[PDB]
Design a protein around this ligand. Structure first.
Ligand SMILES: COc1cc(O)c(C(=O)c2ccccc2)cc1S(=O)(=O)O
Lengths: 273, 274
C-alpha cells in the first residue's frame, strides 16, 4: 500500500510532533504515506493501534512502545521480515533496530557546562530514579561532577510532573536554602520549581544557573543563565525512515540493536545576549 | 467504504493545527476511521497534489485548511458532488461546501471588551496586513467595543504576522510615542516582538501593562502583568468537524452548506492566574 505506520503516545508532546513533521515531509518525499495512531500511552490502546494498522496492510510500523521492550506481543514479529523500528523507546535489542537518545552523554554535556557556574548550593531535581532515562541521566551528571569538591543534593519526585515538583521543592526549602545551580531532568520539573520561586520571590530568578532537559524558546526572556538540551528533531526522523526503507527495499535487513543521536545544547536567558 | 478520512493542513509545526489534528485522530479512531495526514506546506500547488494522492487512497472524505481563496475553480470539480469535503479554519465556497471556522470578529470584540476594564490611558492596537479578511474582522470587533470609549487608541500595523517585524515597528513607534499602558495584539508572534523591545529597553518584562492577545501559551502565567489570551476550542472544533464528515456520509443529504463559527476560549494569565 506504500504506507508506513507511527504509533506514538499522542500528537501533543512537542518532541513527537516535530519529528512527525520532518517525517511527513520526508515520507511524501519518497511517495510513502504516514498513518499516525496514538496510544495515549496506554498498552491496551497501542496493542489495538498496531492491530488496526496490520489490517490496513501497512508495509512498516515505527513505534514508541508503551509495553516492555521484551514482551510476548512484539516477540510475534521477533523473527519476521515485517519491519518494526523503535523510536525513543527501545525494543528487544537482538531482534529490532531502535533509534534512541544519548541521554547519558547528553546529561554529562549539560552538567559539565553547569559546573562552571560559581554556585555553592547545587540541587539536582529528577524523578523515578529506578527508571532508565532517570538513571542514565544521573550517571551523566555524576561523570562530570565526579571529582568536583561541591556536595550536590539530589531530590527525586514521584513523577515527571510540575505539581509534584512544586511540593517536593517547597518542602525541601524548609530545611535547605535556595540553590544557586539547578539541574532538572524534565522541563515539566523546572516549571514546578519556577511556580514556587514566583510565589516566594515575587519574581522569577535573575541570579541562578538553570540547566534542564527539554527546551522552550521563551526561556530567552529569563534574566538568568539557562542551559537546555533538545533533540535533533530532523536528524532523528531521517534515521527512523532510512531504517524502514532499508528493510523494505533491500535484501540485507539492518542489523538489530540501538543507535543514538545526541541532543543539541542551547544558551537561553542572559546567555542569548 | 475504506473507513479513512484525509486531512490536508499547512504544517505540523503550528500548535493550532497539531492540537486540532491530535483530537481529530482520537475522535476518528473512536468512531472507527483512520486519519491520513498530508501537509501542503501552505503552497497552493502542493495542496492540489495532496488532494489527488488522498483520492487515490480512496478516503471517504477529506478535511482541508485551504490555501486557495474561496470559490477558487480547482474546488469546483466537487462543487455539487455527494462526496463530502469539509473545510477547516479557512473557508471554501460557501455555496457548496461546509466550513468549520472561527468567529474572529466575535472573539476580538469580547477580548477587547475585557481589556477596557483596566485603567489604562494609552492603548496601542498592534496588528498586521489590515486589508486581509482576518485582520479586518478582528479590528472590526475591537472598534465595536471601544466605540464610545473616550480614550485614544493608536493603531499600528505591520507588514507581516511575524516577531522581527513587530520589534522594529514598535521601537520606531516609541521614538515619537509614549509607552502604552494597554496592548492589543492579533497574534502571539506580534506580542513576542513587543516583549523583545520591552526587555531590551526596561531590562525586564513589565508588570503594569495590561495585555490581550490572540494565541495562547500556558507560560504566560509567569508574567506579573495582567494577561488575556484567546485560543480555539480545539476539542470542540475537532468534534464538530467530524460530526459533519459523518453526517455527510451517514445521513441522506449533506448538511446546509456554508459557515458555522466557533468562539475561542478566554484564559486569564500573568497575575490573573493567581
Ligand atoms: C494558538 O492560538 C491561535 C493563534 C492564532 O494567531 C491563530 C490564527 O488563526 C492566525 C490568524 C492570523 C495570523 C496568524 C495566525 C489561531 C490560533 S488557535 O486556532 O489555536 O486558537
Amino acid at each position: 500500500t506504500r504506507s508506513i505506520g507511527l504509533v506514538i503516545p499522542d500528537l501533543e508532546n512537542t518532541s513527537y510532533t516535530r519529528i512527525a513533521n520532518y517525517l511527513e515531509r520526508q515520507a511524501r518525499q519518497r511517495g510513502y504515506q504516514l498513518l499516525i495512531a496514538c496510544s495515549e500511552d496506554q498498552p491496551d490502546n497501542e496493542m489495538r493501534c498496531i492491530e488496526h494498522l496490520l489490517q490496513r496492510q501497512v508495509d512498516a510500523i515505527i513505534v514508541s512502545t508503551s509495553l516492555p521492550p521484551e514482551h510476548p506481543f512484539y516477540q510475534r514479529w521477533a523473527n519476521d521480515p515485517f519491519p518494526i523500528v523503535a523510536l525513543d523507546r527501545a525494543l528487544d535489542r537482538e531482534h529490532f533496530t531502535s533509534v534512541v537518545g544519548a541521554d547519558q552523554d547528553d546529561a554529562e554535556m549539560l552538567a559539565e557546562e553547569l559546573r562552571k557556574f560559581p554556585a555553592e548550593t547545587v540541587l539536582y531535581l529528577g524523578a523515578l530514579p529506578e527508571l532508565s532515562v532517570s538513571f542514565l541521566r544521573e550517571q551523566g551528571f555524576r561523570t562530570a561532577w565526579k571529582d568536583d569538591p561541591r556536595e550536590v543534593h539530589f531530590l527525586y519526585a514521584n513523577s515527571y510532573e510540575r505539581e509534584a515538583a512544586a511540593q517536593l521543592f517547597e518542602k525541601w526549602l524548609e530545611t535547605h536554602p535556595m540553590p544557586q545551580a539547578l539541574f532538572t531532568t524534565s522541563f515539566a520539573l523546572l516549571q514546578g520549581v519556577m511556580d514556587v520561586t514566583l510565589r516566594r520571590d515575587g519574581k522569577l530568578p535573575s541570579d541562578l544557573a538553570i540547566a534542564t532537559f527539554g527546551d522552550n524558546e521563551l526561556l530567552d526572556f529569563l534574566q538568568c543563565p539557562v542551559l537546555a538540551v533538545a533533540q535533533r528533531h530532523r536528524d532523528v526522523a531521517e534515521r527512523v525512515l532510512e531504517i524502514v526503507l532499508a528493510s523494505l527495499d533491500e535484501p540485507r535487513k539492518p542489523k538489530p540493536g540501538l543507535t543514538r543521536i545526541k541532543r543539541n545544547l542551547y544558551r537561553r536567558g542572559v546567555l542569548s545576549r
